[PDB]
Design a protein around this ligand. Sequence first.
Ligand SMILES: [Mg+2]
Ligand SMILES: [Zn+2]
Ligand SMILES: [Zn+2]
Ligand SMILES: [Zn+2]
Lengths: 269, 97, 88, 171, 559, 187, 112, 107
Amino acid sequence: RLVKALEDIMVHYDNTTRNSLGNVIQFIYGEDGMDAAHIEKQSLDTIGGSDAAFEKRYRVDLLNTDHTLDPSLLESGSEILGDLKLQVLLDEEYKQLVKDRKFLREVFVDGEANWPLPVNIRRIIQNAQQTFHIDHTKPSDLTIKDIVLGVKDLQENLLVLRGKNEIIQNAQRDAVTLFCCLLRSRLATRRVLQEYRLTKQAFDWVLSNIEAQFLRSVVHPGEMVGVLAAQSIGEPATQMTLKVTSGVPRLKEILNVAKNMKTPSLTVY
Amino acid sequence: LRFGEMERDCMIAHGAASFLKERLMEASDAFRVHICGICGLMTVIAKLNHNQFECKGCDNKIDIYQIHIPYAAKLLFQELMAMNITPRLYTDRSRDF
Amino acid sequence: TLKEKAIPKDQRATTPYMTKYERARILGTRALQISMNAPVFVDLEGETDPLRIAMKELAEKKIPLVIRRYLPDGSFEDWSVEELIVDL
Amino acid sequence: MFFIKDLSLNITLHPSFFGPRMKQYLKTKLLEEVEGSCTGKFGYILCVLDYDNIDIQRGRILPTDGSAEFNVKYRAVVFKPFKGEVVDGTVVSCSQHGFEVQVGPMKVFVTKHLMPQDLTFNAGSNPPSYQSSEDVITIKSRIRVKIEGCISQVSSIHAIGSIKEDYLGAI
Amino acid sequence: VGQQYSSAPLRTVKEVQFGLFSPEEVRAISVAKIRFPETMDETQTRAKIGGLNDPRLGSIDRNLKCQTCQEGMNECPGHFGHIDLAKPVFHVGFIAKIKKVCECVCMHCGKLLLDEHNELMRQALAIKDSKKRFAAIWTLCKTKMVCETDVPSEDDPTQLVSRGGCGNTQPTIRKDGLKLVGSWKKDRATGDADEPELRVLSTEEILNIFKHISVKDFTSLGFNEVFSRPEWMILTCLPVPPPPVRPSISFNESQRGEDDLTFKLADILKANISLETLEHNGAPHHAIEEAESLLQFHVATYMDNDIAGQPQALQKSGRPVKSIRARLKGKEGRIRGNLMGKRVDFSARTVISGDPNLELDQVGVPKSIAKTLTYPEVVTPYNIDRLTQLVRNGPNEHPGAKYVIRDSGDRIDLRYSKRAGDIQLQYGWKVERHIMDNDPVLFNRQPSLHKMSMMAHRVKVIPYSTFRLNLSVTSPYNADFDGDEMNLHVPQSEETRAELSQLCAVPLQIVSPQSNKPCMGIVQDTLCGIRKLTLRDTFIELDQVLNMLYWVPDWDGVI
Amino acid sequence: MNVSTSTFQTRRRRLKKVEEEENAATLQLGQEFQLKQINHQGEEEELIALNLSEARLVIKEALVERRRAFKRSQKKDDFMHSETREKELESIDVLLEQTTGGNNKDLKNTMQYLTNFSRFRDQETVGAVIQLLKSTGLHPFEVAQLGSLACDTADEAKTLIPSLNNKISDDELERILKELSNLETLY
Amino acid sequence: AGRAALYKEVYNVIASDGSYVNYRHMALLVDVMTTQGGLTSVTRHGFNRSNTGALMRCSFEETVEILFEAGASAELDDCRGVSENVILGQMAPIGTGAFDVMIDEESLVKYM
Amino acid sequence: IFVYQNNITPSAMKLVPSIPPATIETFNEAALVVNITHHELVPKHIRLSSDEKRELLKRYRLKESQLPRIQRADPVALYLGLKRGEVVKIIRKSETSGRYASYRICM
RNA sequence: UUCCAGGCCU
DNA sequence: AGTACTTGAGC
DNA sequence: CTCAAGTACTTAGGCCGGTC
Ligand SMILES: [Mg+2]
Ligand SMILES: [Zn+2]
Ligand SMILES: [Zn+2]
Ligand SMILES: [Zn+2]
């Protein structure tokens, strides 16, 4: 029933998801034009943790002896202290990371932080590590500009929908958003240099990978997601070895637009 | 062996375009009839030899097509026809959309 | 009723790369043609097999094939095996 | 008469010929399948024009087997007679029932009963003839006919015509 | 396929236009006058009577003959015949709509019972949708039972205006058997008539009433001026499916066969003849309708036999006689069981037994099947060599082949052809050869409910009669070895295989989207063992380690 | 397989093939020959009536323009003649044996006809005729007939070319006639 | 808010087994139900009634009946439907069939 | 607009389309007690100028139909005084993109 | 071929 | 069997 | 015009005796 009900639902060359009517059924497949195959339980740090801890990890204040980057992590460290121009960028960064906090804590009212997201980033760096034998001892060689300003462009290039106009472009943004959070969560100035002494190269590398590794994760216009989704559901349904109407029968109850549940409940807070 | 529904769905999923068709036709039914370019029926009197194509009644003998479909569907059509149902076939389209 | 064909390579919107299908579909096609005793545009370094030559033609993007991508309505964008990328 | 229509023609090529001399072979094929053809629709196709600019378009590779189908858009000279179209040509054959005049690639036939009666019909004629007070028709003898009717055939639009009206007959 | 080339320019079906035959078309189209009910047999003399079953239509018994069309059996599809009915008969299926349409129009005139004059009507008369419209439309006027000539105009409802005429009250129609009936009225104890006035609706009656229905009214409802005029839901002339739809399964020679259908028609025919003769001759009039309803039955049950008014029209023996509709009816139906799922060539099945010495993506095919399943390979100055080897190598030694096909669409049977040892392949010929080590193949284990319940593996022809597939790929097929079997098909075209190899390979399906995680992975012996192997407390001296090292195909060869 | 030869105008043939007019010099030519046919460029374009000779030129033209592309590749000569009636029957006859399909019997027989019964064996002259005729609102089919059909009286004219009649007056048409029998390239 | 609960409830059906399914799948089906306008059911009555081509719906329960009504209301089928082709024996507008492939003379010359 | 306490005249109501253009909406009291829009599940919608709409189709090569629909009776539909044809931009959170843009046309 | 029946796929 | 639209019916 | 029967439709999917 499921299969015969979704057969003709595929992702067309515009990233729309339709059927023989050309009727839309999802503007951007999966609400993120990504092929489920390339996704792993990433962790969006920028959401949990104490309001306190957040600072200790993402805050970078050059206009301060205790909140600056001890130049053992950075190279241009000492000569940056007080630079009020960099504390502007360094502030937009911290301003944004915090908008994220109050964004994620909004979608994920729950507080949960482990979710399905394209381009595994912990590994993409884990390798970034030993690939350049990076020694945490000696100091990096990036600029508060190198980091902050390159990550900004990393995003400019995680294209999903291509379209040359507002309506389309504005969708692009939407469709990504969440990933990027994950991005700034893990490519934050402090984190970048203090958590894993990322050389200039090492970083410049991690970036390109994240980019194409992303681009690959996108969905291929061709996918017959209808027949897919159906199976993917009706499959773990046959594996359902079964006081509220549970699984198997209930599932049927649903698909039928059950004109009167067996169990009806009504949990009120 | 039978490559029934279950298996079809499977291939669609896979994106296995050609292959599905190949097992649906060449490795099975695969048949050929002639159409009147007008009344989308199998009427045509294919004399594949003197080429005459007539399809009279509709009277053509000039505007005709050859199509490959599964003898099953061919049947399914005469079968629908037998119940006074006309399942016309058109080599082109107009609806656009 | 639009004889207004479709999108000029300029303004094309689709993906810059090739779809897992498009390569699968090309490689096959090209092979099926090479097997048909078609012309081969690489210097086979033996590769007596077609889907090999196909695979190789495809690496020097010397496959004279054009993918006509279709849009949900009818309009289409034309891409050359060259143009398309291959991170597939 | 004689028209020049803009036509087309889907030709399927073998992946075999998927070489560099494709356009080359294609055109050559189109020409094989058109120059000298005939239809009831367009009638006698005579000569394709502008050989140099024959549009081929990107042909599409067929499904199952690798062949390609190209809709070769072309143009050419054609001749399709009509009822009442007045055409004059040279006589060809000639029997007891009438003479067959050839006008262009086509053959219009004139029945005894379709020409003036005073125009007898010489039997012991070498070559066969038809006479009149001051008229003699046979082999060459050019004629001007009025095509009464057409009979589109296999690949040879035939027709019948009279010369019994005025300003019609010999020239 | 269907052999013998035809200059017929060929295409693909793009649109599919559904309609309803016009008795005339049925006529034009028809080649057979179809008069005799009898099968045929020139009265005992074997052949066919120019009556039913090839009075021209397709023919039986390997014979070009087929009203010139020639092309013995395979090629010449059917050639419909017709059979002018005796009296118009409802179409078992449209029945309800024939009623629901009548419940919508008025007799005598054949005009809507709700012109734009009524607003509610417009509301429906504008619901673009040839059905949701005919839905409202009906529900609206299925009540107003008097074809009025006067209604309160688009002005003061005190200055009425006219439209059509004849107000003749209209009877509430109701279903019964295969004929309709309604009951009019006109006052009750007032002036004549009183209670209902039961009158049966004859087809001729109805049919006419529909015919008169207006052109725009046609459409207005939900029909079509060219393909399906209400006036057609009623059969006047009956199209005769030709032999290949009702194949006379003939037992040898001089022995019966005739398909279940061929009977139901012969039935219909007789039932008809009787009717005509009861008219054209001594017509005890209202005793005919008693023998007409019979035709209205056969011609009804012929298409649908599983109805409401029970009488399953048993094929004397109890068999109910398969109605056409039953032929297409879901699952097993021409549709669900023939077109959505066919039986196929180049496929094989056997009991599967797991092997830990194969690569994830291989599949141990028994030599038996390796020599059975072929693959059409074109002769190419690439393989011309290998190929001739296989050919002349015979269809019995494993690496070989059984058929060679020259251009001249004619197959050379290697296992017989007294020139088998000869044969000079021709680049451009084809050589169905044996499935060989590393040909792509679709291997699956129904129930096929997963995308990866059918992955393409590499052939690795082996001995013994079992499909020996790798272990890890056990779980994706939901496969076990306690007597479980598996089907496997063989691609046939260079591009087809390409499609399995480039998209259906096991290495691919390896990480599934129905859960953005891998679906295969180490199990049992390997898993139960991998553990033990690990554990701090577990050491292995040289000798063994050296062997272990060696076993890993790749190993840099450096201890 | 081998398609026919589709034309540039798609009329949606919906079941009802009933109609198909009756070809007549009543200027009721087939639909495939309407004043308003559609140039394969997508743009509209009036019918194209060629009168003898005027057509003979078109043929010989592309027929030779062809003998060149036929040699531009024979690497990777011709160059016209001068009206001589019979001596041309030989000239063209050859040009055929090269650029022609050979068994294209028609095209050859169409040349001998066209070349013998041609009325203005010379380009300029033919353009002259056209400039004259083509400027009468007259349908092409007439513009043709009037061109390739020798005529004297408006009677001989309006008779062999009935369609005319009311169209152009007698004297006027009479003038034009005389104009042709003038331009009528000698022999 | 319905689609919400719809998916919500559906999720728990597959969660009662612990089994995990990527939102996209479930969401899709959940959407295909709601997009229409309200709550389209996955049944002979529900989805298999929408404007899809006749042929397509034909292969799921209304079988004969569905066609009948098609000839009656002279429907038209795009043959955009997966099924449509399958029946027709044509390559279907699916993955490997969502596009055409042509030989571009040009390229086919600059290669040699 | 209007807020009826316990109902209205089945005879009165038949006079809503009595003054076109200017049309009249009917609402119930006990119905507006709580705002549904505020509910944890219902996301924010948004009307669309004939411009914002025609732009939404010109930018998706969509036909009116091909667009996902919202009942004319849809609870939220009335709220924002929806009308047959008007579009809406259902913008909601997402466990995948974080924010999903969706469009609903009116039945 | 067809019609019913029974059976096997932990 | 269960199970969901549809029709028939007393008001 | 608004309420309880009437009225009809699949039921999963491969493979392997007696007599119509
Ligand atoms: Mg088992
Ligand atoms: Zn016909
Ligand atoms: Zn025949
Ligand atoms: Zn009336």
